[PDB]
Design an enzyme around this catalytic site. Sequence first.
Site, PDB file in Angstrom:
ATOM      1  N   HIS A  65      38.223  28.855  43.089  1.00 20.64           N
ATOM      2  CA  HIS A  65      38.960  28.304  44.224  1.00 20.64           C
ATOM      3  C   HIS A  65      38.095  28.323  45.452  1.00 20.64           C
ATOM      4  O   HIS A  65      37.072  28.987  45.478  1.00 20.64           O
ATOM      5  CB  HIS A  65      40.239  29.059  44.474  1.00 20.64           C
ATOM      6  CG  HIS A  65      40.040  30.512  44.688  1.00 20.64           C
ATOM      7  ND1 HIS A  65      40.311  31.126  45.890  1.00 20.64           N
ATOM      8  CD2 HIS A  65      39.647  31.489  43.838  1.00 20.64           C
ATOM      9  CE1 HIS A  65      40.097  32.424  45.767  1.00 20.64           C
ATOM     10  NE2 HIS A  65      39.695  32.672  44.532  1.00 20.64           N
ATOM     11  N   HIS A  67      38.382  29.669  48.569  1.00 19.01           N
ATOM     12  CA  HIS A  67      38.476  30.663  49.641  1.00 19.01           C
ATOM     13  C   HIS A  67      37.072  31.097  50.018  1.00 19.01           C
ATOM     14  O   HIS A  67      36.198  31.222  49.152  1.00 19.01           O
ATOM     15  CB  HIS A  67      39.285  31.880  49.196  1.00 19.01           C
ATOM     16  CG  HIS A  67      40.756  31.741  49.437  1.00 19.01           C
ATOM     17  ND1 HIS A  67      41.654  32.745  49.156  1.00 19.01           N
ATOM     18  CD2 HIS A  67      41.485  30.716  49.944  1.00 19.01           C
ATOM     19  CE1 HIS A  67      42.872  32.347  49.475  1.00 19.01           C
ATOM     20  NE2 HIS A  67      42.799  31.118  49.956  1.00 19.01           N
ATOM     21  N   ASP A  69      35.501  33.779  50.441  1.00 13.56           N
ATOM     22  CA  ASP A  69      34.842  34.839  49.681  1.00 13.56           C
ATOM     23  C   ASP A  69      34.386  34.492  48.260  1.00 13.56           C
ATOM     24  O   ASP A  69      33.858  35.342  47.548  1.00 13.56           O
ATOM     25  CB  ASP A  69      35.700  36.116  49.716  1.00 13.56           C
ATOM     26  CG  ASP A  69      36.926  36.060  48.801  1.00 13.56           C
ATOM     27  OD1 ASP A  69      37.782  35.148  48.925  1.00 13.56           O
ATOM     28  OD2 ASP A  69      37.033  36.978  47.942  1.00 13.56           O
ATOM     29  N   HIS A  70      34.555  33.221  47.888  1.00 16.38           N
ATOM     30  CA  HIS A  70      34.168  32.681  46.577  1.00 16.38           C
ATOM     31  C   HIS A  70      33.370  31.391  46.788  1.00 16.38           C
ATOM     32  O   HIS A  70      32.810  30.851  45.845  1.00 16.38           O
ATOM     33  CB  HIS A  70      35.414  32.323  45.743  1.00 16.38           C
ATOM     34  CG  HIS A  70      36.297  33.492  45.433  1.00 16.38           C
ATOM     35  ND1 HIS A  70      36.156  34.249  44.291  1.00 16.38           N
ATOM     36  CD2 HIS A  70      37.308  34.058  46.133  1.00 16.38           C
ATOM     37  CE1 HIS A  70      37.039  35.232  44.300  1.00 16.38           C
ATOM     38  NE2 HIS A  70      37.751  35.139  45.405  1.00 16.38           N
ATOM     39  N   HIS A 142      47.899  31.480  43.165  1.00 18.05           N
ATOM     40  CA  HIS A 142      47.118  31.880  44.339  1.00 18.05           C
ATOM     41  C   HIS A 142      47.317  30.861  45.462  1.00 18.05           C
ATOM     42  O   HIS A 142      47.525  29.679  45.195  1.00 18.05           O
ATOM     43  CB  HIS A 142      45.637  31.918  43.957  1.00 18.05           C
ATOM     44  CG  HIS A 142      44.784  32.748  44.867  1.00 18.05           C
ATOM     45  ND1 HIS A 142      44.987  34.099  45.049  1.00 18.05           N
ATOM     46  CD2 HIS A 142      43.709  32.422  45.624  1.00 18.05           C
ATOM     47  CE1 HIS A 142      44.069  34.568  45.879  1.00 18.05           C
ATOM     48  NE2 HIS A 142      43.283  33.571  46.241  1.00 18.05           N
ATOM     49  N   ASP A 213      41.154  34.415  41.388  1.00 19.94           N
ATOM     50  CA  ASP A 213      42.125  35.327  42.021  1.00 19.94           C
ATOM     51  C   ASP A 213      43.513  34.908  41.577  1.00 19.94           C
ATOM     52  O   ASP A 213      43.783  33.712  41.511  1.00 19.94           O
ATOM     53  CB  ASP A 213      42.094  35.223  43.556  1.00 19.94           C
ATOM     54  CG  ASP A 213      40.860  35.815  44.187  1.00 19.94           C
ATOM     55  OD1 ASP A 213      40.690  35.590  45.386  1.00 19.94           O
ATOM     56  OD2 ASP A 213      40.066  36.495  43.526  1.00 19.94           O
ATOM     57  N   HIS A 271      37.134  42.472  42.211  1.00 23.59           N
ATOM     58  CA  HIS A 271      37.773  41.951  43.386  1.00 23.59           C
ATOM     59  C   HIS A 271      38.636  43.066  43.924  1.00 23.59           C
ATOM     60  O   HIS A 271      39.829  42.906  44.168  1.00 23.59           O
ATOM     61  CB  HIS A 271      38.598  40.707  42.996  1.00 23.59           C
ATOM     62  CG  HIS A 271      38.994  39.835  44.152  1.00 23.59           C
ATOM     63  ND1 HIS A 271      40.044  40.134  44.990  1.00 23.59           N
ATOM     64  CD2 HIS A 271      38.480  38.663  44.596  1.00 23.59           C
ATOM     65  CE1 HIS A 271      40.159  39.182  45.901  1.00 23.59           C
ATOM     66  NE2 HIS A 271      39.222  38.278  45.682  1.00 23.59           N
TER      67      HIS A 271
HETATM   68 ZN   LIG Z   1      41.246  33.836  47.155  1.00 22.56          ZN
HETATM   69 ZN   LIG Z   2      39.198  36.335  46.501  1.00 23.80          ZN
END
Ligand SMILES: [Zn+2]
Ligand SMILES: [Zn+2]
Lengths: 306, 306
Positions: A65, A67, A69-70, A142, A213, A271
């Site tokens: 996805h 976000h 942090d990815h 998510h 996530d 995570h």
């Molecule tokens: Zn996320």
């Molecule tokens: Zn995440």
Amino acid sequence: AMNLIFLGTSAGVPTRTRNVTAILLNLQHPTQSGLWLFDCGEGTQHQLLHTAFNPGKLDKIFISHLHGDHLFGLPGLLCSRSMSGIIQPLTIYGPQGIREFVETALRISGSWTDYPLEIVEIGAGEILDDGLRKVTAYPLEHPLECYGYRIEEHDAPGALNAQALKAAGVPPGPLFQELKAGKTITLEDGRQINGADYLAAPVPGKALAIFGDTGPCDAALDLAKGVDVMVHEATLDITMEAKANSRGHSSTRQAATLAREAGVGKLIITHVSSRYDDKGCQHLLRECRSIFPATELANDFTVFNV
Amino acid sequence: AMNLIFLGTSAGVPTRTRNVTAILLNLQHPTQSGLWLFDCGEGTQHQLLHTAFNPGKLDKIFISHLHGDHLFGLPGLLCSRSMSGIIQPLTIYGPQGIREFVETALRISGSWTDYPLEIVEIGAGEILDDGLRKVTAYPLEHPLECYGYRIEEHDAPGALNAQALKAAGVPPGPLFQELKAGKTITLEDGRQINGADYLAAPVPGKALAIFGDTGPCDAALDLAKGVDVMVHEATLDITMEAKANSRGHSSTRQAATLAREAGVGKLIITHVSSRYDDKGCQHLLRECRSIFPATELANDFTVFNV
Ligand SMILES: [Zn+2]
Ligand SMILES: [Zn+2]
Ligand SMILES: [Zn+2]
Ligand SMILES: [Zn+2]
């Protein structure tokens, strides 16, 4: 064949000890010995740079996805790849917007690539067939469209039982070739031998599930179903399960229980929330283990056999 | 007042030893003790996280140009800032596209900020007046619109010479207040004293020039002109001056010579090519020094007094 090398194991934001998300998949094949990357949080390329892996081998990148942090970290990797002399082609697979993001980043920054780059906006369903293995996307729960990835290597056809054949009279070499083909080749000892009664036990492939996530969800069980190794987030401990679930995350127990429910060989949690310190992470592990003993905590640079 | 804390010192791409560009400016004032950041290459937030600086103090971010090695890293920092509880407002200053980049990154990644964020597309000329110091953008020679930043703290008005006054009869306290104001207050000893003849030597401010990537250029001398500390790239050694110049970069000598030409107190070189190893960087230093002895090599986490 099949190795997991964790580059980042932290939920949402980096920490002195764990960087944000990025999982490396080493596929050691006889003619497909490449590298695969699942997610690319900021600092991923740095994390890589500190390992002895050949950045040139990496040919495919799978984003669960978008976000930060990815995702943040992908533009820098692409530019670094190009700045090295890497020219081997590269394919990115991810949910819609992935293309717009990468392109915009490159445009504004006055960058390019000197290697062919293919971006692929995906959705649920099979993503590719290696000929040796297939990757399938599964939709998860998510705040952003997020996919889990099931990587399954096709089953290896059963090989001829050389010993059993030798026992039966068939000498190595000549008619060995034919019996291999399937021919019901007969033996000079006056007796026909159907190679189909010696090509025994067709070994099933290894099954891997790298989740994106997620909070509990329907598709979750399919992705997991009997896979050898299951990589699943365990962002918060049991007492925070509601908080977790509200943001599209899972608690320690939820992950372990899904592991159990799906009958998977091993469970690797990641995570983890920056809120927990080393001991807190051992407490997370205990939680999982008391509902599925075969659970392990991923760490930056930790390795795993699928 | 005035400290430089280098977070990244590498040209174009990160290395095991030096991360890409990011320079921190600690402004220790009596009522303006904040943090300023010049550039934000990937990994900048990580680099910060490993220092004891309060990420909350940082209120302004200045981007010289949008090349990945000075920009990727900004989106992650903004998100991390917000994920902490930081709410103190933040202002970003940079060339056109800066806004489109940040916004797009945040949009696609499903992010926001819980602190007011102001993005400012700038151009040549004064950027802001602290009341205590002013920042001015200067256009440089580089493949992308790129600005150098001159930070000058206004001159401190000359203070009253207490000693000289005491010598002259003026006692501390009463008429001291007035003489401070400017009053030509007369002394009981029958004699008028004009405080204007005691408010001596108005101390000039410190001058700092943080350059953006650049090859030799006209504006370069203005930015540099007599500044206390001059931060300038030295991407390649003399034998590569042409290569450097062709990409909007400067050679060791070019930087030192500009230092000299501009009569600056100290020269700090950075943005060194990943091609050079530790010794190669000492060879770079020698080159600069033999044309301006007051040159120093920046290093990740190295500190400097302006
Ligand atoms: Zn996320
Ligand atoms: Zn995440
Ligand atoms: Zn640069
Ligand atoms: Zn540049």
